[PDB]
Amino acid sequence: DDDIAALVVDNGSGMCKAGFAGDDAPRAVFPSIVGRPRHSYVGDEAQSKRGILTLKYPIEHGIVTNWDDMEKIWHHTFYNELRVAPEEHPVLLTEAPLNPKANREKMTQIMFETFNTPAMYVAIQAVLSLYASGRTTGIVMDSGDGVTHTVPIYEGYALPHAILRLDLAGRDLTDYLMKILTERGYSFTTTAEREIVRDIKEKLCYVALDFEQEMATAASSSSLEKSYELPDGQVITIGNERFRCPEALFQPSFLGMESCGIHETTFNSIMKCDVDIRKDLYANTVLSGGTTMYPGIADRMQKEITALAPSTMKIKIIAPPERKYSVWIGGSILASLSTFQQMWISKQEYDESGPSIVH
Amino acid sequence: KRSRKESYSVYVYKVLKQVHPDTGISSKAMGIMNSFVNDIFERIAGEASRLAHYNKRSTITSREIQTAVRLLLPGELAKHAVSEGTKAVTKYTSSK
Amino acid sequence: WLSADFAQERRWKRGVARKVVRMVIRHHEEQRQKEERARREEQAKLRR
Amino acid sequence: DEVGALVFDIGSYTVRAGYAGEDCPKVDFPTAIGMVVEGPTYYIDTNALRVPRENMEAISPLKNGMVEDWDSFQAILDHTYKMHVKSEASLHPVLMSEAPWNTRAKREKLTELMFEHYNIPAFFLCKTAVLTAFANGRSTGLILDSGATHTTAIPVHDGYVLQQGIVKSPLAGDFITMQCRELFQEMNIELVPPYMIASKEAVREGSPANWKRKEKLPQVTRSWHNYMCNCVIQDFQASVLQVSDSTYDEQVAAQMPTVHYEFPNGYNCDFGAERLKIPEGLFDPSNVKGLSGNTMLGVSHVVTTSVGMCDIDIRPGLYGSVIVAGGNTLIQSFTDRLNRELSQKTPPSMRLKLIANNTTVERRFSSWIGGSILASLGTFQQMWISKQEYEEGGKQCVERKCP
Amino acid sequence: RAKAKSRSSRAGLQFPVGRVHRLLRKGNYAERVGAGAPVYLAAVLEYLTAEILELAGNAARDNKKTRIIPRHLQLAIRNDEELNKLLGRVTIAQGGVLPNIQAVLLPK
Amino acid sequence: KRPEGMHREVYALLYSDKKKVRPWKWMPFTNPARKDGAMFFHWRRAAEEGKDYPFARFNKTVQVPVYSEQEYQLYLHDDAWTKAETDHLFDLSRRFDLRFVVIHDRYDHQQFKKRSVEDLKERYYHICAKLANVRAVPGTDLKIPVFDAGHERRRKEQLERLYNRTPEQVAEEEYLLQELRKIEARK
Ligand SMILES: Nc1ncnc2c1ncn2[C@@H]1O[C@H](COP(=O)(O)OP(=O)(O)OP(=O)(O)O)[C@@H](O)[C@H]1O
Numbered sequence A: 001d002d003d004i005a006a007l008v009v010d011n012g013s014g015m016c017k018a019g020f021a022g023d024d025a026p027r028a029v030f031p032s033i034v035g036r037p038r039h040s041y042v043g044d045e046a047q048s049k050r051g052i053l054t055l056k057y058p059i060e061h062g063i064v065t066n067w068d069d070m071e072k073i074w075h076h077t078f079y080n081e082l083r084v085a086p087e088e089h090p091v092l093l094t095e096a097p098l099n100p101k102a103n104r105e106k107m108t109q110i111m112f113e114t115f116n117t118p119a120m121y122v123a124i125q126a127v128l129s130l131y132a133s134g135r136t137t138g139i140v141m142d143s144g145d146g147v148t149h150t151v152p153i154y155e156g157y158a159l160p161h162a163i164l165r166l167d168l169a170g171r172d173l174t175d176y177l178m179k180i181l182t183e184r185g186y187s188f189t190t191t192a193e194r195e196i197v198r199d200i201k202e203k204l205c206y207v208a209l210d211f212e213q214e215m216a217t218a219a220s221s222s223s224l225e226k227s228y229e230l231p232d233g234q235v236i237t238i239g240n241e242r243f244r245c246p247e248a249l250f251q252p253s254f255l256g257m258e259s260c261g262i263h264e265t266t267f268n269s270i271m272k273c274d275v276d277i278r279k280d281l282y283a284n285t286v287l288s289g290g291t292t293m294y295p296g297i298a299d300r301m302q303k304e305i306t307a308l309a310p311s312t313m314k315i316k317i318i319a320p321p322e323r324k325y326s327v328w329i330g331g332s333i334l335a336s337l338s339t340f341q342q343m344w345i346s347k348q349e350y351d352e353s354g355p356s357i358v359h
Numbered sequence B: 001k002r003s004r005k006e007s008y009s010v011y012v013y014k015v016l017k018q019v020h021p022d023t024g025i026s027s028k029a030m031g032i033m034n035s036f037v038n039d040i041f042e043r044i045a046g047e048a049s050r051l052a053h054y055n056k057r058s059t060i061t062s063r064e065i066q067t068a069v070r071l072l073l074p075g076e077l078a079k080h081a082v083s084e085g086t087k088a089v090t091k092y093t094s095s096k
Numbered sequence C: 001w002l003s004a005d006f007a008q009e010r011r012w013k014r015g016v017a018r019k020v021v022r023m024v025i026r027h028h029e030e031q032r033q034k035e036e037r038a039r040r041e042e043q044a045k046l047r048r
Numbered sequence D: 001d002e003v004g005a006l007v008f009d010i011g012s013y014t015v016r017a018g019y020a021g022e023d024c025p026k027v028d029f030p031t032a033i034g035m036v037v038e039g040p041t042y043y044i045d046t047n048a049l050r051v052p053r054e055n056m057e058a059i060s061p062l063k064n065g066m067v068e069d070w071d072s073f074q075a076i077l078d079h080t081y082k083m084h085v086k087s088e089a090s091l092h093p094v095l096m097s098e099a100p101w102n103t104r105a106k107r108e109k110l111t112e113l114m115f116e117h118y119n120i121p122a123f124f125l126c127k128t129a130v131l132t133a134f135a136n137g138r139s140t141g142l143i144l145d146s147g148a149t150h151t152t153a154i155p156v157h158d159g160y161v162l163q164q165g166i167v168k169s170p171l172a173g174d175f176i177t178m179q180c181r182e183l184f185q186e187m188n189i190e191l192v193p194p195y196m197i198a199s200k201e202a203v204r205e206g207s208p209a210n211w212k213r214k215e216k217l218p219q220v221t222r223s224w225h226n227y228m229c230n231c232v233i234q235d236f237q238a239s240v241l242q243v244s245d246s247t248y249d250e251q252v253a254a255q256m257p258t259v260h261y262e263f264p265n266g267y268n269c270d271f272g273a274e275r276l277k278i279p280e281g282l283f284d285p286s287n288v289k290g291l292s293g294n295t296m297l298g299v300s301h302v303v304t305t306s307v308g309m310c311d312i313d314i315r316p317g318l319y320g321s322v323i324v325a326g327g328n329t330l331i332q333s334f335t336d337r338l339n340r341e342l343s344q345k346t347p348p349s350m351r352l353k354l355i356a357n358n359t360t361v362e363r364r365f366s367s368w369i370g371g372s373i374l375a376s377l378g379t380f381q382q383m384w385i386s387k388q389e390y391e392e393g394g395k396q397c398v399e400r401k402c403p
Numbered sequence E: 001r002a003k004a005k006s007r008s009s010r011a012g013l014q015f016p017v018g019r020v021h022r023l024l025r026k027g028n029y030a031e032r033v034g035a036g037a038p039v040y041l042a043a044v045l046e047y048l049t050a051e052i053l054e055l056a057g058n059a060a061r062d063n064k065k066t067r068i069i070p071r072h073l074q075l076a077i078r079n080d081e082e083l084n085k086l087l088g089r090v091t092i093a094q095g096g097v098l099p100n101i102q103a104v105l106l107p108k
Numbered sequence F: 001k002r003p004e005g006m007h008r009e010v011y012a013l014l015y016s017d018k019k020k021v022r023p024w025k026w027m028p029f030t031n032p033a034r035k036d037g038a039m040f041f042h043w044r045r046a047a048e049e050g051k052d053y054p055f056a057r058f059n060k061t062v063q064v065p066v067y068s069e070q071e072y073q074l075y076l077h078d079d080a081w082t083k084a085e086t087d088h089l090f091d092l093s094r095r096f097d098l099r100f101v102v103i104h105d106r107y108d109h110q111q112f113k114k115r116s117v118e119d120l121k122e123r124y125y126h127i128c129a130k131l132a133n134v135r136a137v138p139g140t141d142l143k144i145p146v147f148d149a150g151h152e153r154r155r156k157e158q159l160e161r162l163y164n165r166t167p168e169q170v171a172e173e174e175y176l177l178q179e180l181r182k183i184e185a186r187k
């Protein structure tokens, strides 16, 4: 029963979701970084020893390397298996937004060669995110940690002729926040230090007036400065980054890299989509990813999509209360779906078609 | 405006050619063959209906059809047909 | 040989992904139906 | 048999790039892109394109299926390679589509630019008509492609195009956009693109639009403004316009249910016979004002002329394998009107039949699906113009290696 | 949807399971029919047909004919022990009879 | 107690009536059918590494003779056809798999006077026949069946006269109906 034995693996630019599947939560997520000698480590140990290790992310906006690196992250994730991965391996693994042929074939090659599993499946993270709720279509923002997407997955199928992307709202957002804190006076210059700046997102992630929120709040800065907890006890009243770069998603020009504001980007995606399907695209706009945990994203997407869209079509936004791991939850459900058995790829057909299978 | 009438000639010829590659069949023989198929279909279906009515059941099932075949076919033909039907009902429910 | 294959694979794929998202809806329905089956088990304890 | 390659379909409206063997292209992005001297920069996916940015400049890289600016074409290629394809060009062959009326000079120049700049291991340049035929599953037939710039009937025989049988007409997406512009100007509809709108409110049908203009709009050129307006007009077309079943009759058109549409600025109204009177020019340009010319040929006229300019022995095959493709073919009842006119005008001695590839993906991406299935064949592995072929035969080997 | 598979092919039969089920369900036989009844019926009919066709082809080869005619059907039926009992009360047109001459009416 | 444990229908019917090594790899390969030695890639198995290209059998190009300079000057001479034109015609024939409907379109009308399809086909067949008629020893192709161009011109003319006849189709069909009518009446 591959459905009950299901396993999911998602690499991610910020945190690999390694964890046993079948339930509704991940188990052993890890920072997903690979360290090597300066002149191998992976996970928490590498994140700790960053000071003596050249670290690398095998995730380049979804792209990965084949022969050397990804196998280390897979070995670290192998803990989800019952330490018997060569026998307990009905696993579905990362599916980058759109690099289907090369990435899928090269990844399935490694998987079947290292584990020769009787169960595999290949679906873009978009479809897994949509299965978290289940409906006709999703234009999921899917803002995680590396990229942002507008995947219009109609009827569970990711229409590639309408998929659109955005890159500036990824890792470099943390560097922009670091520059903002430098202007403030902290002046961090390395990841080992701005890990706490990354953590600041846990509270400094609100935006109300996309056009003048930061100014209007600097004018009346009270009861809005959450005063993030610095290690040295410096509780200075953080009150400008509270509203600067949660809005950078809607205003790429605010950072320096230019692109359609996340809202108008999703809008252009559903516009390029079909006309009749565009009604369901408006009505079933999903929001997922770690970056979507910002409380204001829902309301701001509502407002911007209602301003950019016709009056007849409404915006029925749906942000799951646990959108942090909605993609992982939906993937685990799709894996441990009862009558989904027949759709798993197995050693039987691998031994006669290999990666020449549907990919 | 066509008045198309159905028949079992498309499958009676398939079975014929699979059980005898070199032997054919004429149109009159095909008609007699279709008549035989219709007659035995009627017989077996009526017997199954009778069994269902006797058991006070409004639906005919594979078991009624099996007992009807056992009743209709004589001796060493009944057993053959029943083994064929049983094997087919097991190869059909196995999703092959 | 291959032209009809892609046309067939397209209709099959949109059919396959279709029934996938489909059982997805039935699964979610089965979760609400799972809570309803738990309620039916409560009613069965009531009956016992 | 399968080999990791790159299929390119570079049309005057949109460019579709992807891998050979997939049912759909990896990335489809508009071709009417802008330009900004940051040097000249170009964008893809429409998210780096439809952005209000300082000093949006005009540019036209490819018109009528032919390269108009080699610099912008090379930039589009580089961007498609490094941004969305995200792979080195030396690792994947390149099968690129071309318009049948492309010149030998442009063919050889594209070949040399692909062999000396990107260093691709193999190259092939196929015609859009042959690709559409190969996609639809026919080796002989008439390809009817109504793009943004032109509507063309191209007869292909045994996988080869008959230039002397090709026919073209300028009545295309550009004509439809012009007609929509004229209709808006006659009905007093202010065409406001989205980038000029800050906020809007709901107003009653036919009432003026209550919208506020942005306060910090950047410098944009007339060309970029017209591009945004044409995008809005194309949305209006895809959402409103419909072809008349029979020859346009005002009385019958005034008895059709109206279609409601709301422009970005909030102005919402219903359209009656004016949405059906515009698409009539595609089939009968004699009733279009501002088009005082009878030499222009409608869609059915182009089809009939293309079939007639061919040998009489193959006209039955063309009539029986008439293939319809293009973006303009998605207009409601377009293929119905086309089939009606073709059954009326075609001699009954020759069987008429249109392929039912009516899906949006099947229509707009036919030329790319064709190249995909043509490059995903083992037989086609012998027609690849290799880097060694280019080095030995030179730029002129293209004419002999790929007709 | 998925590529539709016919019930006849799924079971392994040639006779039309769909048409057999249609007849069974719309006929006098019963109110509603189970999925297994028409499969079994078609299988039995196909077996009877294969048997009688084998016998008819054997008779045809014996008579030196390549086309099975009603003669080869009548001879087969009246030579077989069980098929004769099955079709005892059935007459076949242009089928004829067997050369069964009573031993008492022979030359002496 | 009932054993069962199997499918309901099958159960009732039956009782009620009692070392891995074979990785796929992105391997390069060469097609023997090609003459340029171009190297391609494919996801081959671990068993047929370096094996010949299976589709190489699909390289049976059309058969077209190749006349020489002396042979042409001696026998294939024609007042209305020059070498510049005949060589191009034969090149088109070899390139486009001997389909004259396409050879006519690929004809270079800018350097040679306009041509139909029938004249081109007649010229090609006459060349093929004359090349081999020089001797009886050639066994490849000696008696090429030169098609008829005279009757073909008529088959073209009196059929194009029927193609574009709009009301004449209906008129002819109606009179043919009436013809059968009174012919059956006079039978
Ligand atoms: N509650 C939160 N509020 C705001 N931002 C968050 C929150 N949780 C995580 N993030 C940010 O989101 C990023 C993680 O993205 P998420 O886990 O949603 O997708 P991901 O898997 O990390 O990205 P990818 O899918 O590309 O690997 C982190 O880098 C973190 O800075």
Ligand SMILES: Nc1ncnc2c1ncn2[C@@H]1O[C@H](COP(=O)(O)OP(=O)(O)OP(=O)(O)O)[C@@H](O)[C@H]1O
Binding pocket: D010, D011, D012, D013, D014, D015, D063, D064, D065, D146, D147, D148, D149, D150, D172, D173, D174, D176, D234, D237, D238, D326, D327, D328, D329, D330, D331, D364
């Ligand atoms: N959904 C739609 N409904 C109606 N028309 C559409 C639709 N989508 C696109 N179009 C029209 O399609 C045209 C462009 O389509 P297409 O992609 O066929 O052009 P192309 O072939 O890529 O380029 P070219 O036309 O220069 O060859 C535009 O003029 C647009 O108006």
